[PDB]
Amino acid sequence: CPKPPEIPKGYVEHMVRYHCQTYYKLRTAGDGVYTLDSNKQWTNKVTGEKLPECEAVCGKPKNPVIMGGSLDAKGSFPWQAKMISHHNLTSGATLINEQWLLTTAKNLRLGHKNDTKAKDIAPTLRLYVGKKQEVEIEKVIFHPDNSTVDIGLIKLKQKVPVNERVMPICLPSKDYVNVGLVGYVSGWGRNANLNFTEHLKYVMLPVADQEKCVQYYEGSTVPEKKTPKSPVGVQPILNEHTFCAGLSKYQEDTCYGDAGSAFAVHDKDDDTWYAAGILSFDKSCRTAEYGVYVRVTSILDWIQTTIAD
Amino acid sequence: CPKPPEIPKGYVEHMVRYHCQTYYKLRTAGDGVYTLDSNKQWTNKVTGEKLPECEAVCGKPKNPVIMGGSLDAKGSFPWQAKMISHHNLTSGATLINEQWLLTTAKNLRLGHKNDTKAKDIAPTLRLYVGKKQEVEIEKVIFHPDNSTVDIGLIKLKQKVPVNERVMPICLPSKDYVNVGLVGYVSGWGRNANLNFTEHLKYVMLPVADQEKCVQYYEGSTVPEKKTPKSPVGVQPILNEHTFCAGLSKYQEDTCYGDAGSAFAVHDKDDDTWYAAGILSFDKSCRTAEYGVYVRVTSILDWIQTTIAD
Amino acid sequence: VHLSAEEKEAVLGLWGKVNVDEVGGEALGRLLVVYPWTQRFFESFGDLSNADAVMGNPKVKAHGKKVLQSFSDGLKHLDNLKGTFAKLSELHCDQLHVDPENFRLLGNVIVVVLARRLGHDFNPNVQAAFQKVVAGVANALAHKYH
Amino acid sequence: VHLSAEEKEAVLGLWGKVNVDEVGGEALGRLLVVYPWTQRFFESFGDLSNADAVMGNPKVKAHGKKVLQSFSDGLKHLDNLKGTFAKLSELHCDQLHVDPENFRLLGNVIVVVLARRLGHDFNPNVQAAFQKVVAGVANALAHKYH
Amino acid sequence: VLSAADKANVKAAWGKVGGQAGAHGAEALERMFLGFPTTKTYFPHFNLSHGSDQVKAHGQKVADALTKAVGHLDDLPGALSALSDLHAHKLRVDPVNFKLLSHCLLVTLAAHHPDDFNPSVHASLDKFLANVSTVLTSKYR
Amino acid sequence: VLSAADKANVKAAWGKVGGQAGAHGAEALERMFLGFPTTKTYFPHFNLSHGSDQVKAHGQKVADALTKAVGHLDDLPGALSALSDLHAHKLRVDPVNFKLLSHCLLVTLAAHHPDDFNPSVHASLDKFLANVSTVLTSKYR
Ligand code: HEM
Ligand code: HEM
Ligand code: HEM
Ligand code: HEM
Ligand SMILES: *[C@@H]1O[C@H](CO)[C@@H](O[C@@H]2O[C@H](CO)[C@@H](O)[C@H](O)[C@H]2NC(C)=O)[C@H](O)[C@H]1NC(C)=O
Ligand SMILES: *[C@@H]1O[C@H](CO)[C@@H](O[C@@H]2O[C@H](CO)[C@@H](O)[C@H](O)[C@H]2NC(C)=O)[C@H](O)[C@H]1NC(C)=O
Ligand SMILES: *[C@@H]1O[C@H](CO[C@@H]2O[C@@H](C)[C@@H](O)[C@@H](O)[C@@H]2O)[C@@H](O)[C@H](O)[C@H]1NC(C)=O
Ligand SMILES: *[C@@H]1O[C@H](CO[C@@H]2O[C@@H](C)[C@@H](O)[C@@H](O)[C@@H]2O)[C@@H](O)[C@H](O)[C@H]1NC(C)=O
Ligand SMILES: *[C@@H]1O[C@H](CO)[C@@H](O)[C@H](O)[C@H]1NC(C)=O
Ligand SMILES: *[C@@H]1O[C@H](CO)[C@@H](O)[C@H](O)[C@H]1NC(C)=O
């Protein structure tokens, strides 16, 4: 602001219009233009003295596009976070906004006894986003239904600066999961050598028929006839709040440590990236036909509600 | 230079809106708002660093509303100027803008001989506006048609500051002169005691039939039959470029020294004050029925043209 | 106002043989008839349309007494005129807005009705002394004007 | 890579007794059959549909020779591995985007075809020396990756 | 501007003056020189003391000009023709003085004809003297 | 995930091993301990030196578990049942090691049966060993 020239018999009124950094969006009531009072107040007709806020754009990677392949070369999954237990097991996160990330309740408890309180689990975790950027976590919230929804929320102490590398995915406004839809699953979990992957990778997986999946893992469909038919040692959590994905065209699958990652769909109408699911059952490896994802639609209400406090 | 508050993750774009001191008005093509360039210069979308200008609001007195009466108590005729010849005769002026005033060619020559050059008349004059404020005059221009249009222009050395007391009248955009319309004529000329009035006064005069007027002063209408029938010693200049006014309801008239004053009409649509005429023949006193005014419409072209240099 | 020893006797003497109530009523009425723009100050007095109406007007008669009796009080103190009429000057200027031309005109009208009523008694020298007086109260009324 | 005096003789010695062109063509074909997501890199090679197709593929045979002959050059300089494969590392990382898992997988496949062709000659100790080598070229190919 | 009724009044009132005209003329002059001593300025060559027959004479000329005017009311500039350039140009007498003399004429008229000077007649005579004043001042430059 | 054709190949291949199983078991162990010395970590109580009959013995147990698996291909978790908690919980052996041992099993198999180990069979045996590896690692916490 160089002072503007004076004009004879006339004076000057000062204003400003606010703009946001790239990757952010102006949030106001409010036209963004603020103007200096005789009271030395910067004011706007709509919002009073209240300034605009800058908010991270979500689900819009700067460069859009696990036992099998697809190395993430371009950094196309900005929302992916890597979480590590005190006892050194890697698992997935997926950043949902500037200070929150979704994850599985199971991932959260990797260190500890299943009755461990969230207060005691949080100091234990290490969380990373983008390149090796660590983020400092404040709090952790398990989902209210222990047995059914495998989900937890991670609140960071403060907002992550958003850039090419780090940026949240979008929560869906609709139900994307119908069979045959191919989502993108990025993950930090174990690979074909049963080693935690050193570089972040992604697979493309089709969503699978829900009845076929339940017949696969359980008897089933009548509850009293259900048996534990899982071809790996352990049983998925399977209900109305979950969906299944098959293997890739190339027979690639998801494995230990991949849970907590998003089943990420790219909406062609929006050109935006939505999290349709969070990987719950990462034990398929190539051994079982189906991974199991908790569907983000089911947890949407709870997410907004929880973030509200 | 003023310091607007800070947004996190956002930057300011500086602007200014120009405003004008009261009694003045913004003159520029685009709005008065200039935003700061990345080239560090203040720019308008339409005027491009060309600044706005402040010019005087004309024809809008702060306090709206000669042998007879009506003392100007409120100072309702800001455009009225008093002019005095080297030999101490008072006459009228009427300020047309910040640096110009209309007057009659006759007034201008009061001290002098028929052929005196304008260069020589100007240093001789004294001119006052408002309260006893003197204005210093640079130049004087007689109208090109000596015999027909009794008019001159007076250019001040510099612009008058405009206020309650001093402010120009408006030039008409249309022809206000139709018989029966009552204009306001303010004037410094002689009163019922044949003495120059000590306080400025105004009369309200109706415009009169042009044909009746010509029959009154001249034969007439056929030129070769015209005789000098003026009831005072001297003949008005009467043509297409003049109009006539009668006496007031109270039998008041205009007298020596009132010439150069405006026949001022108040347009009810505009709520603004226009100069419909300039008093030419001030010899009417109460002796003759009609004063004669040069119509401002006829001199409009010439006025803008002359001010252009 | 500067007025001679014999001039004072003249004025005071003459004033003793004139009906001031009657001359005020006549003088105001004639001012109204002769200089019609003065009727503008009197709209509230009723019918001013023709001359017989103005002279016949009961409010004109009554108001004229008031101004001419104000004049009598003027003669009482000549040396301090400005202060006698100072109150009225405020009224006439700042309230009523009367041009001082009109004080002068009414002053002279009063002089012509004095002439008309007093005849040969109102000779050039006594008129000259009255002119000094009417110019004195006109100037005293115009005093509060800027 | 750190390799003992006797370990080098073992590796170099065995290498004299294997057909590297033939093992490359077998090893690449097996990797393609056994870990099918690797076929993704080879779309341009023609028919990869079934196993006989992959093994029978003339372009696979030919490309496999190229990789195993690149291995031979690896054995030539063990002390500077990173620099030998530096050029190829740039290709494999920045051009082709191969996950380093795949280098490790192919390395082990080569080891199982060496076992298959050499039988009793490829005994636990000579295999242990070969593991050091295949881990060396895998790590040398993954070197240019961030 | 002197209506038909005005003209009637003026003609009537001046006719009533009659042979006193020249005397009224001189009386108005003496009243003016005494009442408004500044008017004396224009007459430095005159004996202005009381009883001066140089003013008694001048008053006759003034009364005559007036009688001529009353006979000519439909054309004042023509009746007064020679006198306009005289007062306005040669003598160059400031217009304020004319209301002074007119006033004195009125005073004399009222004093000598109290029952003929009613407010209508007063009004007509004032206007007449005003019109004469204008004709004699309109060329003042 | 072990198709009918896969299962056929696995059954066929392991049957062809026959009496050599316990011996293939021990050889795979020695190859692992030599090739990937870190795996030695889980066996501090073992004499790991060449010809150790403590590993000759352990190799037999491993071969047997595998023979049991080959007879049970339609249910791996059931066949391997006790061994899952053993490796995942008691022994807590990191899942990377299972791909190592599987590899060594494959190396032994290829060395001893070169004309029976064609890429289809290689593929089937790899998947089988991978499925065993998963069953034994899925409870790792
Ligand atoms: C020598 C000259 C004058 C004198 C001595 C004089 C004196 C007075 C006096 C004593 C009053 C009484 C008001 C009161 O008691 O508050 C008055 C009122 C007034 N005068 Fe004058 N006056 C003079 C001239 C004039 C003239 C020339 C005009 C108008 C042309 C005028 C217009 C008025 C008006 C409109 C009032 C208000 C009375 C009412 O309520 O109707 N005066 N004057
Ligand atoms: C030890 C491991 C490897 C070695 C020594 C190796 C060596 C080579 C060499 C020498 C070339 C020649 C390219 C040129 O001359 O410009 C090549 C090309 C190539 N390699 Fe590798 N490679 C290895 C692993 C892999 C793996 C695991 C894959 C895929 C899963 C792969 C995919 C490719 C592809 C797609 C090409 C391009 C050839 C073409 O145009 O078709 N490589 N490699
Ligand atoms: C009703 C108004 C007047 C009338 C009708 C009138 C008429 C006349 C006449 C008839 C003459 C004589 C011209 C001659 O003898 O050729 C005259 C001369 C003159 N007048 Fe006036 N006059 C008027 C007003 C005045 C006034 C107000 C003044 C000055 C206060 C004035 C100053 C003179 C002088 C100085 C002369 C020359 C006298 C001499 O030198 O003998 N007149 N006027
Ligand atoms: C195909 C994969 C494997 C199979 C089928 C297998 C099978 C077995 C069997 C049958 C036993 C004996 C249990 C008993 O005697 O009750 C055992 C024990 C054991 N295993 Fe494994 N195992 C496998 C992989 C591994 C790996 C990769 C490691 C470590 C690198 C490992 C470490 C051990 C240890 C330390 C014991 C205890 C041995 C003892 O104390 O005698 N296992 N396993
Ligand atoms: C992984 O977890 C272990 C404990 O569960 C960490 O403990 C380390 O143990 C090593 C020796 O094996 C020490 O040299 C380190 O100083 C220890 N570090 C800590 C924080 O205890 C271990 O650090 C973790 N990761 C690694 C690579 O050692
Ligand atoms: C008006 O004009 C005259 C000349 O045309 C001015 O001349 C003055 O004359 C008086 C005496 O009569 C002197 O006392 C002054 O000094 C003169 N002043 C000048 C500027 O010449 C006259 O000033 C003007 N107005 C007044 C009020 O005197
Ligand atoms: C397994 O990977 C090891 C390295 O650590 C892994 O990859 C690195 C970059 C990190 O992401 C780390 O958290 C992972 O655990 C190697 O030292 C080791 O040789 C590898 N084992 C095999 C058989 O490849
Ligand atoms: C005549 O006017 C005198 C005042 O001066 C005049 O008017 C003023 C404002 C100036 O313009 C000035 O140059 C003029 O000469 C009064 O003092 C005087 O009383 C007036 N005389 C009569 C009879 O009204
Ligand atoms: C947690 O799981 C264990 C068994 O693994 C069980 O014995 C225990 O009761 C459980 N505690 C809670 C709070 O679920
Ligand atoms: C899980 O379900 C049980 C049922 O009583 C409940 O007490 C418990 O609070 C739930 N979860 C945890 C972590 O305690």
Ligand SMILES: *[C@@H]1O[C@H](CO)[C@@H](O)[C@H](O)[C@H]1NC(C)=O
């Ligand atoms: C110029 O003045 C002379 C006298 O000096 C006069 O005769 C003539 O008519 C005048 N012309 C104009 C246009 O005033």
Ligand SMILES: *[C@@H]1O[C@H](CO)[C@@H](O)[C@H](O)[C@H]1NC(C)=O
């Ligand atoms: C008047 O106009 C004429 C041209 O028509 C010109 O010759 C003359 O100089 C002008 N006179 C005056 C006084 O302007």
